[PDB]
Amino acid sequence: HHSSGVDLGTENLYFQSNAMAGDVELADRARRRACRLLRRWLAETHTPVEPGPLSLRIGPVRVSAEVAYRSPTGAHGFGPIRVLDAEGVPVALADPVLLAAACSADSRSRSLPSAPINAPDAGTAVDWVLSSLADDEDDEVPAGMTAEEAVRLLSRQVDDLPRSPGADPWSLVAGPFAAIGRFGRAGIADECWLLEVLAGRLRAVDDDLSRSWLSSPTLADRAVLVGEGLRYRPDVRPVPFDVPNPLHEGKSDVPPPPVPVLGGPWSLRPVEVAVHGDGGPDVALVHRWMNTPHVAHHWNQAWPLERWREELAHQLGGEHSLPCVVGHEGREVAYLELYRVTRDKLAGCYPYGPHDLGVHIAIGEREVLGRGFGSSLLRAVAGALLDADPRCARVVAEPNVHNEASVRAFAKAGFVREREIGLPAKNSALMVFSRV
Amino acid sequence: HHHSSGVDLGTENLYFQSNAMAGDVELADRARRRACRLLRRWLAETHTPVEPGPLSLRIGPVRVSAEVAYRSPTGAHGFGPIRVLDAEGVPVALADPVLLAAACSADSRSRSLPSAPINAPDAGTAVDWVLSSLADDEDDEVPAGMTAEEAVRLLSRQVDDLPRSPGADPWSLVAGPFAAIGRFGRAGIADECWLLEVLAGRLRAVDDDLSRSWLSSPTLADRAVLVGEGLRYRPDVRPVPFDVPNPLHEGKSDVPPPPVPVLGGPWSLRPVEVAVHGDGGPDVALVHRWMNTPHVAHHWNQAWPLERWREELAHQLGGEHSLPCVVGHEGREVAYLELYRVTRDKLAGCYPYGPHDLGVHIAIGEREVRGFGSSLLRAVAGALLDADPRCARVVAEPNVHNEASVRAFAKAGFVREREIGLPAKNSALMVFSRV
Ligand SMILES: [Mg+2]
Numbered sequence: 122h123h124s125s126g127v128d129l130g131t132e133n134l135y136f137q138s139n140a141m142a143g144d145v146e147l148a149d150r151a152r153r154r155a156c157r158l159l160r161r162w163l164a165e166t167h168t169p170v171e172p173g174p175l176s177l178r179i180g181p182v183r184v185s186a187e188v189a190y191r192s193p194t195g196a197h198g199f200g201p202i203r204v205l206d207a208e209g210v211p212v213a214l215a216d217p218v219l220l221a222a223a224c225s226a227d228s229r230s231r232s233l234p235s236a237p238i239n240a241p242d243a244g245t246a247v248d249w250v251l252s253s254l255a256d257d258e259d260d261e262v263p264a265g266m267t268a269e270e271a272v273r274l275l276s277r278q279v280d281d282l283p284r285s286p287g288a289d290p291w292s293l294v295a296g297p298f299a300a301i302g303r304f305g306r307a308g309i310a311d312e313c314w315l316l317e318v319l320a321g322r323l324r325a326v327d328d329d330l331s332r333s334w335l336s337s338p339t340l341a342d343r344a345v346l347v348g349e350g351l352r353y354r355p356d357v358r359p360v361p362f363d364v365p366n367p368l369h370e371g372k373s374d375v376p377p378p379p380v381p382v383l384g385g386p387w388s389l390r391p392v393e394v395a396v397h398g399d400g401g402p403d404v405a406l407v408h409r410w411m412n413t414p415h416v417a418h419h420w421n422q423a424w425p426l427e428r429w430r431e432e433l434a435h436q437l438g439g440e441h442s443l444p445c446v447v448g449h450e451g452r453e454v455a456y457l458e459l460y461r462v463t464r465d466k467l468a469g470c471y472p473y474g475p476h477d478l479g480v481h482i483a484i485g486e487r488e489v490l491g492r493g494f495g496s497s498l499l500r501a502v503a504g505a506l507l508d509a510d511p512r513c514a515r516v517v518a519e520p521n522v523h524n525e526a527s528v529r530a531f532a533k534a535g536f537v538r539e540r541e542i543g544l545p546a547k548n549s550a551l552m553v554f555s556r557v
Numbered sequence: 558h559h560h561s562s563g564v565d566l567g568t569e570n571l572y573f574q575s576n577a578m579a580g581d582v583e584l585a586d587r588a589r590r591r592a593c594r595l596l597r598r599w600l601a602e603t604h605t606p607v608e609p610g611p612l613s614l615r616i617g618p619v620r621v622s623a624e625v626a627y628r629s630p631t632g633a634h635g636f637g638p639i640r641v642l643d644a645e646g647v648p649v650a651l652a653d654p655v656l657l658a659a660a661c662s663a664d665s666r667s668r669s670l671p672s673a674p675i676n677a678p679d680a681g682t683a684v685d686w687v688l689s690s691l692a693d694d695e696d697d698e699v700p701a702g703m704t705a706e707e708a709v710r711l712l713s714r715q716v717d718d719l720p721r722s723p724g725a726d727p728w729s730l731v732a733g734p735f736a737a738i739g740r741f742g743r744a745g746i747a748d749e750c751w752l753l754e755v756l757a758g759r760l761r762a763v764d765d766d767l768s769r770s771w772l773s774s775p776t777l778a779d780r781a782v783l784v785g786e787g788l789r790y791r792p793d794v795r796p797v798p799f800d801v802p803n804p805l806h807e808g809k810s811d812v813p814p815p816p817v818p819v820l821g822g823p824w825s826l827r828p829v830e831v832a833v834h835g836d837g838g839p840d841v842a843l844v845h846r847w848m849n850t851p852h853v854a855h856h857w858n859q860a861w862p863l864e865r866w867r868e869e870l871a872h873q874l875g876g877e878h879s880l881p882c883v884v885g886h887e888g889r890e891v892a893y894l895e896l897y898r899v900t901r902d903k904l905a906g907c908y909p910y911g912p913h914d915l916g917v918h919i920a921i922g923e924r925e926v927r928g929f930g931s932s933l934l935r936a937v938a939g940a941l942l943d944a945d946p947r948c949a950r951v952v953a954e955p956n957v958h959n960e961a962s963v964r965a966f967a968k969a970g971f972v973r974e975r976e977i978g979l980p981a982k983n984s985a986l987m988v989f990s991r992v
């Protein structure tokens with residue numbers, strides 16, 4: 122006699138509570154899925170990761186999670202992933218389809234509207250995650266596995282790599298590296314040490330792939346969330362991209378960026394920062410330009426004067442970036458950073474040569490100056506850089522694919538669009554001006 | 558210099574992190590409440606029947622199952638854990654809100670026509686909507702210690718403050734007082750059947766025109782957020798009206814079974830004959846044949862073994878709901894149809910029906926044995942109106958995707974009146990009205 126419910130016996134309670142027992146595992150499976158998505162999002166955007174709090178804007182939601190274990194292969198161990206409101210209040214747990222929707226909105230927004238990921242019949246990562254819920258979950262690493270047994274399996278996997286012509290270059294990341302990360306995240310062994318063991322195992326095979334994987338500064342991986350060429354029918358059709366190679370060495374003895382000498386109406390000189398007092402008029406010029414709206418909309422570095430004063434001094438003191446003032450017929454009109462790719466965020470995004478040089482540019486005195494001048498300056502800088510460093514093979518840039526006037530200026534100057542790349546705050550057209 | 562892949566831990570670190578973890582329990586409960594709100598809407602807007610005990614349903618690409626612990630007279634059901642099941646019935650996920658919204662969206666967009674506003678490229682999706690609502694202030698809960706006395710007070714005030722005559726908006730009764738009754742019921746404050754009695758008295762007390770409507774129609778206006786060809790999400794949802802069963806309405810009329818119409822002209826119609834002896838007889842064999850040919854099974858989805866159809870036909874013939882018949886055209890037995898009483902049918906929750914309303918499902922077996930289709934439909938509707946003088950209209954519910962059928966019904970004199978959400982499809986409600 123209950124009418125709005127079921128009349129309850131102990132047998133009823135038994136059936137249902139038995140069912141409630143597997144829910145703990147279900148929640149754990151959702152956690153594992155959301156973590157797999159977050160790792161891919163971090164790798165495919167080349168977002169830097171450190172131990173401790175991680176804070177991220179993914180499409181329409183703010184996402185945050187503690188990085189309890191930072192993995193050298195990106196196999197990070199996370200705390201609870203939470204969605205935050207504008208003030209920083211947790212309003213939700215970031216379950217997998219939620220992450221898939223946020224990532225999809227962000228990725229589709231990063232690429233151009235004409236891109237394949239944005240075609241009407243392309244599907245979305247939400248369809249892909251949805252259609253995958255019944256997939257067999259992979260076995261976990263045995264929590265009690267020995268490090269010796271870990272080396273055993275890893276060598277097995279490295280030798281069994283097709284290691285021949287026709288085989289897939291991304292196989293190293295997909296197989297041996299993935300295993301190393303799961304071993305690391307389980308606490309079985311240290312990943313840096315497992316990578317050394319992997320390195321020697323590759324020296325033992327004088328195959329062509331083996332030598333490549335030991336020497337190139339980046340490695341082939343496959344992206345499932347970021348990339349203009351993505352499709353989900355409803356299954357993901359991944360697209361290739363490049364990631365940093367942990368087996369390739371740290372610092373190199375590459376000199377600082379050279380000071381080119383521009384031809385034509387253009388002039389260029391390094392930025393000067395006085396140790397004494399304010400920092401000088403160059404610090405104020407850049408600071409002024411960087412805080413105007415049309416520049417911060419691209420550079421997003423609208424900082425106080427003293428933060429820019431120390432950024433410039435930090436760059437000048439180092440071997441990475443060289444800040445310069447550009448003149449046109451007597452007037453100081455532009456700021457540039459010339460940088461060595463090898464010491465730059467760009468080094469994780471494409472197979473660079475050791476002397477590769479990049480250019481960031483902000484036109485400050487556009488306000489009453491310039492039309493057609495863009496390609497001209499870019500062309501003058503690119504050629505002068507190749508002239509100043511004969512060991513430099515190419516000059517590169519990474520305008521936002523949405524900055525269509527910038528992309529056009531680079532192409533008209535002679536840069537060619539080599540690929541799209543995923544960066545922490547944008548997708549870029551990788552523009553390459555090659556030496557011939 | 559001891560922890561490179563992690564942070565060096567002190568008690569203050571543990572304190573910061575565990576404090577933040579205490580709030581996760583409320584976060585999970587908030588997701589649970591959102592998912593339940595979405596499932597209640599999905600069940601209401603698809604008119605899916607709900608009883609206490611296990612509930613199992615297909616939503617787009619996923620199978621969903623949940624225990625119905627509290628079956629609410631206003632659809633404010635109380636659920637156990639909502640799980641996604643694979644083909645064998647093994648749970649593979651907990652159905653969190655954005656998951657449910659994505660399955661419901663895929664299913665709804667699939668239910669409506671490609672030209673529908675819900676399917677435009679510039680339309681949002683329920684996913685955009687749920688996503689954009691996570692930072693909303695969660696709505697106040699019913700105070701668990703509230704009295705039923707206080708429940709009636711607030712309910713009476715709310716019904717009396719309804720706009721009544723000026724301005725209209727009829728979905729206000731379901732959206733206002735009924736929503737409160739369901740929340741009171743689900744919280745255990747009072748019995749919903751009792752709260753509905755109380756609400757009825759307050760509506761008799763004014764006898765305005767809306768109050769009179771709300772006590773007499775067999776359906777009520779409600780507003781849909783997941784199912785409906787005209788839905789849009791401008792991040793925020795733009796609801797569309799639809800009808801739901803009226804709990805305040807008695808019904809239970811002494812409505813007879815369907816009559817046997819008499820077709821003239823080239824047409825003939827007789828009830829199906831089911832032999833007790835052996836196979837079931839030649840009519841059971843005819844329907845079985847037709848229902849398993851490809852062009853019919855693509856719409857009816859009843860390409861069954863002969864033994865199942867013998868028992869289906871006999872079950873219909875024995876009851877008061879549906880009447881299976883064989884239709885001839887100039888001597889050849891060419892079609893099968895069911896005439897059914899709406900008041901005993903799933904259609905009864907979808908529009909304000911009259912007690913004697915009659916419906917038609919039809920399958921043409923002897924296909925082109927072309928153009929004869931609307932003519933048959935027109936003959937049946939008129940003959941049904943002749944056979945039952947108290948019947949107000951003849952209806953049908955072709956799948957909105959079955960446009961050849963919809964067109965044939967319109968050419969016969971039916972009006973495509975609205976789209977309706979049904980358990981396995983959206984249908985175009987075709988109405989052949991007597992006046
Ligand atoms: Mg009992």
Ligand SMILES: [Mg+2]
Nearest residue numbers: 564565566567
């Ligand atoms: Mg410690």
